Amino acid sequence: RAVGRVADTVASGPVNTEQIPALTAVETGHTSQVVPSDTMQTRHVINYHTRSESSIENFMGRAACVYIAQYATEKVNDELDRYTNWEITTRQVAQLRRKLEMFTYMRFDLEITFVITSSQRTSTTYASDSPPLTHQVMYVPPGGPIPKSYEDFAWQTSTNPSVFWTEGNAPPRMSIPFMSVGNAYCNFYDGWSHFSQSGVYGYTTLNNMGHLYFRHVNKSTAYPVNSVARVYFKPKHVKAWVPRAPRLCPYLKARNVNFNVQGVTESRNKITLDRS
Amino acid sequence: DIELTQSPAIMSASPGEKVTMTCSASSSLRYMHWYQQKSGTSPKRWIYDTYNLASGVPVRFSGSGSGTSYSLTISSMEAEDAATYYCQQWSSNPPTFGAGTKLELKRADAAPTVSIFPPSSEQLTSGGASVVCFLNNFYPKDINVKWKIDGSERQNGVLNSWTDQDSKDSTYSMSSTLTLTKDEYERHNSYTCEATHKTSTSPIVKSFNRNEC
Amino acid sequence: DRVRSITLGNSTITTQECANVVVGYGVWPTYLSDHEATAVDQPTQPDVATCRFYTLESVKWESSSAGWWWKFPEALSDMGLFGQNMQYHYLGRTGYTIHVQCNASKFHQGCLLVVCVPEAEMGAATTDHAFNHTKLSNIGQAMEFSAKKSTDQTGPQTAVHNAGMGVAVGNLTIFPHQWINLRTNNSATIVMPYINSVPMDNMYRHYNFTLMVIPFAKLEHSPQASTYVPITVTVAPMCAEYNGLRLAGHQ
Amino acid sequence: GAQVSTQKTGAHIIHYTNINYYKDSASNSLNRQDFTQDPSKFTEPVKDVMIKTLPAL
Amino acid sequence: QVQLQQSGSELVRPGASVKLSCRASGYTFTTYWMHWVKQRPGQGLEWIGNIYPHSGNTNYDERFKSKATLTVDTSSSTAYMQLSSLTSEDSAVYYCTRDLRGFAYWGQGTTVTVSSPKTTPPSVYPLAPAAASMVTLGCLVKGYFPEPVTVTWNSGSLSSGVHTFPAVLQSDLYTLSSSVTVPSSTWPSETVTCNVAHPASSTKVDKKIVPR
Amino acid sequence: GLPTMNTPGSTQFLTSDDFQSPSAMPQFDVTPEIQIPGQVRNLMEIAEVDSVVPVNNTEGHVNSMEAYRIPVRPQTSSGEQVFGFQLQPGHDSVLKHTLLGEILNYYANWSGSMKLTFMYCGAAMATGKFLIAYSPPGAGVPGSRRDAMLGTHVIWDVGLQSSCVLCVPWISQTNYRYVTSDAYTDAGYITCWYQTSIVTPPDIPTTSTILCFVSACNDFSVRLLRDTPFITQQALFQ
Ligand SMILES: CCCCCCCCCCCCC/C=C/[C@H](O)[C@H](N)CO
């Protein structure tokens, strides 16, 4: 028998026994293993179904948007300026955060894809021939020197990893290893940053993954141009421990588990079904 | 609606205590800038991107603030920390920011002296009259002053000039002056000044008369 | 069977209506091994002065009760030499045996859910405000859930149907749990191992798990019956060891 | 290093070849063909074994 | 280092087009936003106008619209902030700040008043008492219309206890005071004098203080 | 210069592809993994665990613990109804927010048998018998115990073992049903009836409480991964 394949049902007949598979006790914390071959008469079914879609690698291994960055070729305010930054976190989007918060601890590699589009800013004229735009997405490790402005020396990236990409081609992509200092990524942290139980409470004190800096490598354009970089994360080689109950209430903040009080489900009119 | 400034107008702190800041903005923000305006030159930049750095700012300075309330907290005050602090936010109608959060260095509270300099012959010849009394070397800033001549009080034409914080003693010096006329000074006798403060019980009195030359 | 004796140190718990014992995630508590250690110095291992049954205070079950929670190891900070070893050491690592016990007659009814929830990070009551550590866990006091929602400026959100975490309280039965059904049950026993992402941790800055006792069916009886039903919680550390000996904390 | 596995196909020419091109194991593709499981940690976390047909108490 | 400073202007005959000059040359030229922060004696910090050299896209603020022309001239590297059709409210210290992420490179700021007054000479008046081991001194300056004033004591030889007082305007004229501490060893032994000079009006007033 | 040719599909970003990419941190030494208890390898290990069902979700009881408590009392005539819902494990408002319901909402197909466990939480001196049935969808919901004894039922006898399991079999014409329910893949109805009554001694409160738990059997599976329709946002969380 293959692994992942669900169990077949055996044939059963009528019984008159002192055995009681239906009568149990859920006070023990034990979920009963009653199959339909215990409370009725079944036929022999050969079941070819497989649990391939339900694996942790298949359930997590889709690329999901985690951040939408914005930067222009000419500065109007801040935001948006000629460059922008992003502290790496998986908690600004609701879809991947709820998928990750079904487990307490995790361990995975990371594949990062950027979809960098561009559009012309609103002006009185647009007729201008422009060369192809080149972008840089520098990764600054925790503690390193951050770019203070445009044309800064820190974009020389002698040890920091950095990608260059010209518009029109395939999206860029690079793989990341497992970057935690402990043995697993903590999705939750019931604790504080200081030993006196003050400071920051929650998972914010544990996530320290560095920043991600974006800019145009072209010096200028004729007329200004806004640009949007979408970050896509796909976990791979995933391990997961201690499953949590699923999040019911909608999130409010990217650094907190805070919530407004919601009902447990939706309401109906009466507890009984009524028709014939 | 809609005005935006710092929350405390005039504070006071000694070198050795906490300096925690609070501001207000009419519109939300993502970044926040904190500055320091000293009396005598232009202000300087102390905190950008709510935490990052400056050129000459030491390690004891800290900052935060998101949306409509800012916080540029100093963990320990020293003698070089006497300046006014304002915010910044770029817009789309920048809010505007505050005017600056005033503060003075704290030490033992000083009681002043009051010296009346009578008008000489050179002012009364030209056509003017000004009886002065100078309240110098006091602390804190607040003084109730009053002009009393021959018993009754006078508040027209009075002045309240304010020196800044000193660099040697960090106290204040105030000029309490009224202006008069050449026959307005020739119809009263005893021109006095009392400087009411919480340090002393009774305000200090110096008196002079007109019937002596 | 329904009898059970548990002996740990110089203390013994007897039970005559026991359901069973829930053992963690199938894992018994054990000591750390050489291929999982990080700190280099030798740890201390007081096996009988520290691994013994420590009883907390009691709570009163009413027909309006919402539920209680305790956060560990901070709930046993004043208990004996277990609390004295937490003060002098930087790291600690232990498993637990929790025995929650609530007796009533055959004329009372009610059901409690007794969960042990790892990393139960709680959300604040006044959102946009940070909140105190005294409202999250006192040293041995039982913190109380509420029926309706909480509007405290510096505490957590205590509406029990959200369990203080933003989830449905009915889905808490994936954490190691047992029920105390007064029709059939007298007490609940849960054996918890050490669950963390690091092999050792500070026992002051970090709450490992939160033991919640939530009434799902409320206590109701005749008025001429006994009206005071208490619930008592007895916790024993298991395989506790400590690294990093310095002066007494904690700051 | 040509690893020849079995393709995912239905029930009732079926293989594929993979080369690894990079030196880091973080650079590989996903492990989509591992479907092992044991739910007895969560569904039966008890100390004494509970037989299905027997009484529970 | 970003060089150098900004230049100040005096009261002009009315009707002309005023024009400042910011010499901000630490360039790094030329793609930046020279935001002109303004400040009254009420210490309120608002903005006057910006520009962009690559295109010419100037900006403004609701109080200084109609008209504040700020044209870019990169060969001169200058930035103007004067507004046409302005009124007498603009007596303010004028910053001309180049850009970075925050407001990093500020200017030193020039004060320019505008009205239709006449330059009046200063009037150094005697302040001498008519009693201890020390005494104070002073010489009041009454009635000077433009803001430049001078505070000198004995040509800079007794310049320690000189407490500098601001001149709050009343009836559109400035009035401050300027004192010094004089011990009894020099009082009334030696000659102590003061001088208030107005360089915009070109008159120097010297007085020797003798006690009555 | 090896002669190649580009097929359709080049320079595209499909979000469910398996390609290799160059590492950004080359020769990085990852920290060694330890034995944490509770490793999850399949999502169906979670869905096979009992979670209590909010059957009494009539407004306003969804903001309290009254959603989970099914009231039972001594009756005046036998054969009444206790509760009833339609078997839609990812669409019905009774079952979609349980532990089995939140996992099915990440998918579009489901298949297999499910378990319904009921727990009498009354006094130790009160006795009762119930009939929990399951009706396949061809003829509408039953309206009496006579219309429900003809279906797939079980008769619960309340005694020392406080729990009983109604196991819902897999009866359909397709191999998979749809999570967001349509008329083609209807799964039926679940009703519960009074077999006799609740008979208590004196000095015992009248109204009592049953808790209901749902899980999945060992032949359960899901298919067609999709996004959940439960979580939503307008702007990015700051
Ligand atoms: C221009 C080069 C771009 C290269 C991109 C490098 C960024 C990789 C750093 C992120 C790696 C860790 C991501 C963090 C994952 C979750 O937040 C953890 N569960 C919590 O720490």
Coordinates of N, CA and C in Angstrom, one line a residue, chain A residues 81-228:
Chain A
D81 N 9.7 58.7 -2.3 CA 11.0 59.3 -2.6 C 11.7 58.5 -3.7
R82 N 12.9 58.8 -4.1 CA 13.7 58.1 -5.0 C 14.1 56.7 -4.6
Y83 N 14.0 56.4 -3.3 CA 14.2 55.0 -2.8 C 13.3 54.7 -1.7
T84 N 13.2 53.4 -1.4 CA 12.3 53.0 -0.3 C 12.9 51.8 0.4
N85 N 12.4 51.5 1.6 CA 12.8 50.3 2.4 C 11.7 49.5 2.9
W86 N 12.0 48.3 3.4 CA 11.0 47.5 4.0 C 11.6 46.5 5.0
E87 N 11.2 46.6 6.2 CA 11.6 45.6 7.2 C 10.8 44.4 6.9
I88 N 11.6 43.3 6.7 CA 11.0 42.0 6.3 C 10.1 41.4 7.4
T89 N 8.8 41.2 7.1 CA 7.9 40.6 7.9 C 6.8 39.9 7.1
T90 N 6.2 38.9 7.6 CA 5.2 38.2 6.9 C 3.8 38.5 7.5
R91 N 3.6 39.7 8.0 CA 2.4 40.0 8.8 C 1.8 41.3 8.4
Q92 N 2.0 41.7 7.2 CA 1.3 42.9 6.6 C 0.2 42.5 5.7
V93 N 0.2 41.3 5.2 CA -0.9 40.7 4.4 C -1.7 39.7 5.2
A94 N -3.0 39.6 4.9 CA -3.8 38.8 5.7 C -3.8 37.3 5.3
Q95 N -3.5 37.1 4.0 CA -3.7 35.7 3.5 C -2.5 34.8 3.8
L96 N -1.3 35.3 3.8 CA -0.1 34.4 4.1 C 0.1 34.4 5.6
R97 N -0.3 35.4 6.3 CA -0.2 35.5 7.8 C -1.1 34.4 8.5
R98 N -2.3 34.3 8.0 CA -3.2 33.3 8.5 C -2.8 31.9 8.2
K99 N -2.2 31.7 7.0 CA -1.6 30.4 6.6 C -0.4 30.0 7.5
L100 N 0.4 31.0 7.9 CA 1.6 30.7 8.7 C 1.2 30.6 10.2
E101 N 0.1 31.2 10.6 CA -0.2 31.2 12.0 C -1.1 30.0 12.4
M102 N -1.1 28.9 11.6 CA -1.7 27.7 12.0 C -0.7 26.8 12.7
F103 N 0.5 27.2 12.8 CA 1.6 26.5 13.4 C 2.3 27.4 14.4
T104 N 2.8 26.9 15.5 CA 3.5 27.7 16.5 C 4.9 27.9 16.0
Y105 N 5.6 26.9 15.6 CA 7.0 27.0 15.2 C 7.1 26.4 13.8
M106 N 8.0 27.0 13.0 CA 8.2 26.6 11.6 C 9.7 26.6 11.2
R107 N 10.0 26.0 10.1 CA 11.4 26.0 9.6 C 11.3 25.7 8.1
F108 N 11.8 26.7 7.3 CA 11.7 26.6 5.9 C 12.7 27.5 5.2
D109 N 13.0 27.1 4.0 CA 13.8 27.9 3.0 C 12.8 28.9 2.4
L110 N 13.3 29.9 1.7 CA 12.5 31.0 1.1 C 12.9 31.3 -0.3
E111 N 11.9 31.3 -1.2 CA 12.1 31.7 -2.6 C 11.4 33.1 -2.8
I112 N 12.2 34.1 -3.2 CA 11.6 35.5 -3.3 C 11.6 35.9 -4.7
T113 N 10.4 36.4 -5.1 CA 10.2 36.9 -6.5 C 9.7 38.3 -6.4
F114 N 10.2 39.2 -7.3 CA 9.8 40.6 -7.3 C 9.1 40.8 -8.7
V115 N 7.9 41.4 -8.6 CA 7.2 41.8 -9.8 C 7.2 43.3 -9.8
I116 N 8.0 43.9 -10.6 CA 8.3 45.3 -10.6 C 7.7 45.9 -11.8
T117 N 6.5 46.6 -11.7 CA 5.9 47.3 -12.8 C 6.3 48.8 -12.6
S118 N 5.8 49.6 -13.6 CA 6.2 51.0 -13.7 C 5.1 51.7 -14.5
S119 N 4.9 53.0 -14.1 CA 3.9 53.8 -14.8 C 4.3 55.2 -14.8
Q120 N 3.8 56.0 -15.7 CA 4.2 57.4 -15.9 C 3.4 58.3 -15.0
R121 N 4.0 59.2 -14.3 CA 3.3 60.0 -13.3 C 2.5 61.1 -14.1
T122 N 1.4 61.6 -13.5 CA 0.5 62.5 -14.1 C 1.2 63.9 -14.3
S123 N 1.1 64.3 -15.6 CA 1.8 65.5 -16.0 C 1.0 66.2 -17.1
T124 N 1.5 67.3 -17.6 CA 0.8 68.0 -18.7 C 1.2 67.5 -20.0
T125 N 2.4 66.9 -20.1 CA 2.9 66.3 -21.3 C 3.7 65.0 -20.9
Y126 N 3.6 64.0 -21.9 CA 4.3 62.7 -21.7 C 5.2 62.3 -22.8
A127 N 5.3 63.1 -23.9 CA 6.1 62.7 -25.0 C 7.6 62.9 -24.7
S128 N 8.2 61.7 -24.4 CA 9.6 61.7 -24.1 C 10.1 60.3 -24.3
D129 N 11.2 60.2 -25.1 CA 11.8 58.9 -25.3 C 12.7 58.5 -24.1
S130 N 12.5 57.3 -23.5 CA 13.2 56.9 -22.3 C 13.9 55.6 -22.6
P131 N 15.1 55.5 -22.1 CA 15.8 54.2 -22.1 C 15.2 53.2 -21.2
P132 N 15.5 51.9 -21.3 CA 15.0 50.9 -20.3 C 15.4 51.2 -18.9
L133 N 14.5 51.0 -18.0 CA 14.7 51.3 -16.6 C 15.3 50.1 -15.9
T134 N 16.3 50.4 -15.0 CA 17.0 49.3 -14.3 C 16.8 49.6 -12.8
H135 N 16.5 48.5 -12.1 CA 16.2 48.6 -10.6 C 17.2 47.8 -9.8
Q136 N 17.4 48.2 -8.6 CA 18.2 47.5 -7.6 C 17.4 47.2 -6.4
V137 N 17.5 45.9 -5.9 CA 16.9 45.5 -4.7 C 18.0 44.9 -3.8
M138 N 18.6 45.8 -3.0 CA 19.6 45.5 -2.0 C 19.0 44.9 -0.8
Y139 N 19.7 43.9 -0.2 CA 19.3 43.3 1.0 C 20.3 43.7 2.1
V140 N 19.9 44.4 3.1 CA 20.8 44.8 4.2 C 20.6 43.8 5.4
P141 N 21.6 43.1 5.8 CA 21.5 42.2 7.0 C 21.3 43.0 8.2
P142 N 20.9 42.4 9.3 CA 20.6 43.1 10.6 C 21.9 43.7 11.2
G143 N 21.9 45.1 11.3 CA 23.0 45.8 11.8 C 23.9 46.5 10.8
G144 N 23.7 46.2 9.5 CA 24.6 46.8 8.5 C 24.3 48.3 8.3
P145 N 25.1 49.0 7.5 CA 24.9 50.4 7.2 C 23.8 50.5 6.1
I146 N 22.8 51.3 6.5 CA 21.6 51.6 5.6 C 21.9 52.7 4.7
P147 N 21.4 52.8 3.5 CA 21.6 54.0 2.6 C 20.9 55.2 3.2
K148 N 21.7 56.3 3.4 CA 21.1 57.5 4.0 C 20.3 58.3 3.0
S149 N 20.6 58.1 1.7 CA 19.9 58.9 0.7 C 20.1 58.2 -0.7
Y150 N 19.6 58.8 -1.8 CA 20.1 58.4 -3.1 C 21.5 58.8 -3.3
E151 N 22.2 58.1 -4.2 CA 23.6 58.3 -4.6 C 24.6 58.0 -3.5
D152 N 24.1 57.4 -2.4 CA 24.9 57.0 -1.2 C 25.9 55.9 -1.6
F153 N 27.0 55.8 -0.8 CA 28.0 54.8 -1.0 C 27.5 53.4 -0.7
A154 N 26.5 53.3 0.2 CA 26.1 52.0 0.6 C 25.4 51.1 -0.4
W155 N 25.1 51.7 -1.6 CA 24.6 51.0 -2.7 C 25.7 50.3 -3.5
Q156 N 27.0 50.4 -3.1 CA 28.1 49.7 -3.7 C 28.2 48.3 -3.4
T157 N 27.4 47.8 -2.3 CA 27.1 46.4 -2.0 C 28.2 45.4 -2.1
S158 N 29.3 45.8 -1.4 CA 30.5 44.9 -1.5 C 30.4 43.6 -0.7
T159 N 29.5 43.6 0.3 CA 29.3 42.3 1.0 C 27.8 42.0 1.1
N160 N 26.9 43.0 1.1 CA 25.5 42.8 1.1 C 25.0 42.2 -0.3
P161 N 24.1 41.3 -0.3 CA 23.6 40.8 -1.5 C 22.7 41.8 -2.2
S162 N 22.7 41.7 -3.5 CA 21.9 42.7 -4.3 C 21.6 42.2 -5.7
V163 N 20.5 42.6 -6.2 CA 20.1 42.1 -7.5 C 19.8 43.3 -8.4
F164 N 20.2 43.2 -9.7 CA 19.9 44.2 -10.7 C 19.0 43.6 -11.7
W165 N 18.0 44.4 -12.2 CA 17.0 43.9 -13.1 C 16.5 45.0 -14.0
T166 N 16.6 44.7 -15.4 CA 16.1 45.7 -16.4 C 14.7 45.3 -16.7
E167 N 13.9 46.3 -17.0 CA 12.4 46.1 -17.3 C 12.2 45.4 -18.6
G168 N 11.1 44.6 -18.6 CA 10.7 43.9 -19.8 C 11.0 42.4 -19.7
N169 N 12.0 42.0 -18.9 CA 12.4 40.6 -18.9 C 11.6 39.8 -17.9
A170 N 12.1 38.6 -17.6 CA 11.5 37.8 -16.6 C 11.7 38.4 -15.2
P171 N 10.8 38.1 -14.2 CA 11.0 38.6 -12.9 C 12.2 38.0 -12.2
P172 N 12.9 38.8 -11.3 CA 14.1 38.2 -10.6 C 13.7 37.3 -9.5
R173 N 14.7 36.5 -9.1 CA 14.4 35.4 -8.1 C 15.7 35.0 -7.5
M174 N 15.7 34.8 -6.1 CA 16.8 34.2 -5.4 C 16.2 33.4 -4.2
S175 N 17.0 32.4 -3.8 CA 16.6 31.6 -2.7 C 17.3 32.0 -1.4
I176 N 16.7 31.8 -0.3 CA 17.2 32.2 1.0 C 17.2 31.0 1.9
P177 N 18.3 30.8 2.7 CA 18.2 29.6 3.6 C 17.5 30.0 4.9
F178 N 17.5 29.0 5.9 CA 16.8 29.2 7.1 C 17.7 30.1 8.0
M179 N 17.2 31.3 8.3 CA 18.0 32.4 8.8 C 17.9 32.7 10.3
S180 N 17.1 31.9 11.1 CA 16.9 32.1 12.5 C 18.2 31.8 13.3
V181 N 18.3 32.5 14.4 CA 19.3 32.1 15.4 C 18.9 31.0 16.4
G182 N 17.6 30.8 16.5 CA 17.1 29.6 17.2 C 16.8 28.5 16.3
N183 N 16.3 27.4 16.8 CA 16.1 26.2 16.0 C 14.9 26.2 15.2
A184 N 14.0 27.2 15.3 CA 12.8 27.3 14.6 C 12.3 28.8 14.5
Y185 N 11.6 29.2 13.5 CA 10.9 30.5 13.4 C 9.8 30.4 14.4
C186 N 9.7 31.4 15.3 CA 8.6 31.5 16.2 C 7.5 32.4 15.6
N187 N 6.3 31.8 15.4 CA 5.2 32.5 14.9 C 4.6 33.3 16.1
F188 N 4.7 32.8 17.3 CA 4.1 33.4 18.5 C 5.2 33.5 19.5
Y189 N 5.1 34.4 20.4 CA 6.1 34.6 21.5 C 5.3 35.2 22.7
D190 N 4.9 34.4 23.7 CA 4.3 34.9 24.9 C 5.4 35.4 25.8
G191 N 5.8 36.6 25.6 CA 6.9 37.1 26.4 C 7.3 38.5 26.1
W192 N 8.4 39.0 26.7 CA 8.8 40.3 26.6 C 10.2 40.4 26.1
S193 N 10.7 41.6 25.8 CA 12.1 41.8 25.4 C 13.0 42.0 26.5
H194 N 12.6 42.6 27.6 CA 13.4 42.8 28.8 C 13.1 41.8 29.8
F195 N 14.1 41.5 30.7 CA 13.9 40.6 31.8 C 13.1 41.1 32.9
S196 N 12.8 42.4 32.9 CA 11.9 42.9 33.9 C 10.4 42.9 33.5
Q197 N 10.1 42.2 32.4 CA 8.8 42.1 31.8 C 8.2 43.5 31.5
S198 N 9.0 44.2 30.8 CA 8.6 45.5 30.2 C 9.1 45.6 28.8
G199 N 8.9 46.7 28.1 CA 9.3 46.9 26.7 C 8.3 46.4 25.8
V200 N 8.7 45.6 24.8 CA 7.9 45.1 23.7 C 7.4 43.7 24.1
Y201 N 6.0 43.5 24.0 CA 5.4 42.2 24.2 C 5.0 41.6 22.9
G202 N 5.3 40.3 22.7 CA 4.9 39.6 21.5 C 5.9 39.1 20.6
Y203 N 5.6 38.8 19.4 CA 6.5 38.2 18.4 C 7.4 39.2 17.8
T204 N 7.3 40.5 18.0 CA 8.1 41.5 17.4 C 9.5 41.5 17.8
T205 N 9.8 41.1 19.1 CA 11.1 41.1 19.6 C 12.0 39.9 19.1
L206 N 11.3 38.9 18.5 CA 12.0 37.8 18.0 C 12.3 37.8 16.5
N207 N 11.5 38.5 15.7 CA 11.7 38.6 14.3 C 12.7 39.8 14.0
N208 N 13.9 39.4 13.6 CA 15.0 40.3 13.2 C 15.6 39.8 12.0
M209 N 15.1 40.2 10.8 CA 15.5 39.7 9.5 C 16.1 40.7 8.6
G210 N 16.3 41.9 9.0 CA 16.9 42.9 8.2 C 15.9 43.6 7.3
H211 N 16.5 44.5 6.5 CA 15.7 45.4 5.6 C 15.9 45.1 4.1
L212 N 15.1 45.6 3.3 CA 15.1 45.4 1.8 C 15.0 46.7 1.1
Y213 N 16.0 47.2 0.4 CA 16.0 48.6 -0.1 C 15.8 48.5 -1.6
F214 N 15.0 49.4 -2.1 CA 14.6 49.5 -3.5 C 15.0 50.9 -4.1
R215 N 15.4 51.0 -5.4 CA 15.6 52.2 -6.0 C 15.7 52.0 -7.5
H216 N 15.7 53.1 -8.3 CA 16.1 53.1 -9.7 C 17.6 53.4 -9.8
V217 N 18.2 52.6 -10.7 CA 19.7 52.8 -10.9 C 19.9 53.9 -12.0
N218 N 18.9 54.1 -12.8 CA 18.9 55.2 -13.8 C 18.9 56.6 -13.0
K219 N 19.7 57.5 -13.5 CA 19.9 58.8 -12.8 C 18.7 59.7 -12.8
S220 N 18.0 59.7 -13.9 CA 16.8 60.5 -14.1 C 16.0 60.0 -15.2
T221 N 14.8 60.6 -15.4 CA 14.0 60.5 -16.6 C 13.7 61.9 -17.1
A222 N 13.0 62.1 -18.2 CA 12.7 63.4 -18.7 C 11.5 63.9 -17.9
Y223 N 10.4 63.1 -17.8 CA 9.3 63.4 -16.9 C 9.2 62.3 -15.9
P224 N 8.7 62.6 -14.7 CA 8.8 61.7 -13.6 C 7.9 60.4 -13.7
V225 N 8.4 59.4 -13.0 CA 7.8 58.0 -13.2 C 7.7 57.4 -11.8
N226 N 6.5 56.9 -11.5 CA 6.3 56.1 -10.3 C 6.5 54.6 -10.5
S227 N 6.9 53.9 -9.5 CA 7.2 52.5 -9.7 C 6.8 51.7 -8.5
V228 N 6.3 50.5 -8.7 CA 5.8 49.6 -7.7 C 6.5 48.2 -7.8

